Amino acid sequence: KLELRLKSPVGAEPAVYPWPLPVYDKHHDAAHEIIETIRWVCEEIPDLKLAMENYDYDTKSFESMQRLCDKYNRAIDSIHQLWKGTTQPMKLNTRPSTGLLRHILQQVYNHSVTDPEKLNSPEVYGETSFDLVAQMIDEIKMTDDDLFVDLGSGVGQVVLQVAAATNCKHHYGVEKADIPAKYAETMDREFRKWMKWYGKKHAEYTLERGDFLSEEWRERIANTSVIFVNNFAFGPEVDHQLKERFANMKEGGRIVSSKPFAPLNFRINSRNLSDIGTIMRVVELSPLKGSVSWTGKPVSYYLHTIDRTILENYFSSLK
Template identity: 35%
Template sequence: MDLDSHKRQRKATSESKSVDSNRKLKSEKAFERKDERLQFIHAVDVASLEHKCVPIMGASKEDVAIELQYPTLQRREKFELVWGKDKIDAVEASIRIVRLVAETYLTDAEAEPFTNQNNGFIRRLEKASNRNIQDLMGFKAALREYNETLLALVEDGVVSKNLDNLHELPPHLAAFILDQVYDRTVAPKVELLSKYENGTDYVYGELLHPFITKLLVEQTKMTSDQVFVDLGSGVGNVVLQAALEIGCESWGCEMMENACNLAEAQEKEFHARCLLWGLEPGEVHLERGDFRKNSSIHDALKRADVVLVNNKAFTSQLNDDLIRMFLDLKSGCKIISLKSFVADSKSSHNINDVGSTILEVEECTYPEGYVSWTNAGGQYYISTRK
């Protein structure tokens, strides 16, 4: 999408829903001073000549290195202009980052050097990377000027001041940051998630960013002073999205060791990335083990406003156990699930009665492209604790 349509979309979104005025987006720490100790995974650590990628734009081995400034005082990220299957695309990432900075962190007037249709940084980067007329030196020159211009705006306090006036994060920016985290931590080791058993509670699947935005922003209308809990949180994607996009206290619990290890890596990179982007997420708590036996999760559930359970592949016994846990939920708490706890809890007549007694269930439909395990759409359920 081009910049103008993104700007229109942002304004339309702000006008169509209430803004959480209590949400504080800015990380004070990100603008105080450069933290030389800040550890994050550079793109070059995932996609480089060392990783058997090949140079692009006619670059020689000596010319592939580039650095990218983020809208804070923190150090720049290192990329290489290379290509490799399923690897980070430095050219596309550079253009996306410049665009996201211009549209989110700057006013229209401040963004003019970035967005000018004739000679703005975005236009110059796009022209230089055009497949028919690839201009390596032009691309690197535009990137250097972008770095210097943005850093000057950060040092002058312009970006920090603009962030103070923002109370919501555009969903496409949140999704991009979360993808950055995932691409540097989970994607290189994604084969570890294939070692799951069908027909058991150990089956892995992800709800994708647009689905979670719809659930948390549009349907349950979560705010930053609320509590979110994901039961069976996998590698932590949804927990991190809730903390970043909503700014709420966000909990997750997972029992599979490989997923827990990747979730831990994601959480570490997530906090570093938020600092790079100058953003303050909500509290993140990722627990290991069986959520039925985790006291911290039970305590969080008593305060929860929204609970997510991707129970598409859960056994009937586990779904029955969950209904017992839902007895502790406060009135009005929303439970989002892929299977209904009232219609499908048939293993015990009494438990089924409990489900229908304590929950009001609304059946909804999600379109294609909302879950990782199929391209097709499907049903999901929003249950409200009576």
Template identity: 30%
Template sequence: MSIFNQKSKFKVKTEVRSVRQAVEPSPRPPPPKQKSSGANGRLTAASNSSSRVASPRPPTSAAARRSRGQSASPQVDNDATGAGSVARKRIIGGGGYSQSPRSFSLTSSGDEDEDDDWEDNLDARKRQKRAHQGRLLVDRNRTLRHPKLWVGDETDVAHASIIHAVDVASLKQKCQPVLGLAADQVAVKLQYPGSRYPERYELVSGKDKIEAVKDIIKVVNYVASTYLTDDQATDFLDQTTGIIRKLEKSKNTNDGPGFKLALRDYNERLRALQRKGTIAKNLDGMHGIPKELVAFILDQVYDRTVAPKIELLAKYKNGSDNVYGELLHPFISDIIERTKLTSEKVFVDLGSGVGNVSLQAALEIGCESWGCEMMENACNLAEAQKKEFSARCRLWGIKPGAVHLERGDFRKNDNILAALKRADVVLVNNQAFTSQLNDNLVSMFLDLKPGCKIVSLKTFVHDNKNAENDVATSILDVEHLTYPEEYVSWTNASGTFCISTKKVYS
């Protein structure tokens, strides 16, 4: 049974003061030779981030991922973060380093011996696939298919205006050829489900660069697992003759020509499905995106726009409100569920940094999404992300919600003030805000409509205030909650946050 036309298995969490993450059933113990276990599910729930600055690679064990609410899916490399293995530094208050929860396992570590256990790997994947299929938010009112999806019309001349992987990871960037290929053999192209024009890669590897081989295998897997029914995906996922099997075997045996041949086969088969109308038909039957795919697309955008210029985010004024920190993918997915955000609602992020949260909300649930930031470097990177995000959503054939990223002080921005009056969910990462700015925000909340949810790192209602004179107390009902480890960029530790609801009568 495919992911099409399924009911969502998500349930909005209602616990107070704790976030309880479901622990997935343990997979079958791995065979003796195998060094990493997993399951091929149809895209398990991914870590989701929103406001995030780059982070180093996370723990690689399946147990470590499950402890953070992650799946142990082998569908993404253990030593890769997000799209490729770009090492992401996290910056706040001078720049502490922590680990990102965005990691899944696609293959064993690469030994030829491990390749002998492929069938055991796939059997485990099949067993867990059904359980993972439900890990997406389904909104029956959402139209997922991009209006400019390519359906085989050869007259289409609109080239994909993306930043190609080769633009940030190539021999010119001092990367090294992989898979035993010579320098003049590394150029390849990768087809996506939404466009006739592929992305250009070089099969190279470099520190803090996109790892082309891993990135390509992930894309092929996500396409087959998400866009195709089980029968249609057989040519890609079959345990003995499937394209992913061939790609991974070539990777494990350092067989460059074999990898390129399998990739060419994938490109041709996907283009045939596009011309046949299969991709368009399947997208028309989908009303949600697996969280892994959401995270992967956002990471692709981030790796091509923010990561190469990450040092710019370290430049801020100490002691001001302009301190940069990010909320990671899983935190925002949790917020989307808790606040019951849908494609028909309006989301506003006050202090949106490089725009990660706004982009995630628009992609994951398809809502109208706003952000406002005043730090110049962050605004410039946010604009670059928005441009790449739009182009890459078309590449994937997915229609996101409308995204509006504003510059300047959100207290004075007319567009933001107007959006707040319509907002259903407002996010304020006020961890480092001054008390004056927090008081200003409370005054702004007077214009919110009743029932609007405000998610913040710190409460706006303080115990040391007189309730009669405390505006926040008079207009907000506050729920205090705890987030687990690896939810924010500035610490590995867990912490607290609040969801405040604008009172109906105030």
């Protein structure tokens, strides 16, 4: 029946929406996905922006929606034309800006998480931690050297965010529970599709089914240089096993978490000598003012860097 279609700015399969356009949740529907996508594409292509200094808008009239899609598609055609002339294509494979990325990931999520219901009351998945993760990404400089892992990666959004944002040799997510691992497969597909659609590049990444305490993971963890773990509700048993597995990490390796694995007020003495606190610097990271603020209360986060010289110094300090 009735449809709206958006042409990709790089000639990928157009995006096709049914009318009336679905609503996703109380604060998201396809209408606004459509508008937001159009706006984002104008940011990729200043030229497209120039073509469309015309658009507030009526999202419940199909006619009003279709003029918008039409103007956009037509300007797209116009742009593709320009690129046959001496004007060169928009720089091919760049990373998406943050703004675009937040959009894309919203899009991927909504197209992948059909029924946001099979996900338990409490924020045990982190639904709007995008800005938070974005902050982390800003602070923890990463490079083609690093390997990244999100321990208990959920449906994968954080892995996708980092992979989109950084140039690690590889990013990994590992998830035990079956239903989110299922969703992650679609997330993965949706993500690849939308990134092609906007013609934006991403670092290599993999989503996996697995337990991060499983024998196999001991080795991998020791090999990972950047670990993100949202351990807020892990408690005693699991924190310990993790500390265990961290102790084998190379010098420089980083762990970013919600609960600290050492303490910050930690100075090295006779009976704390096998405490992990001896092989790692720990800092409290500044929270975001607009923090999701778990437990109706402002909460911050922790960067641990594997630094053995801390130990070495305590053996130099015995002459």
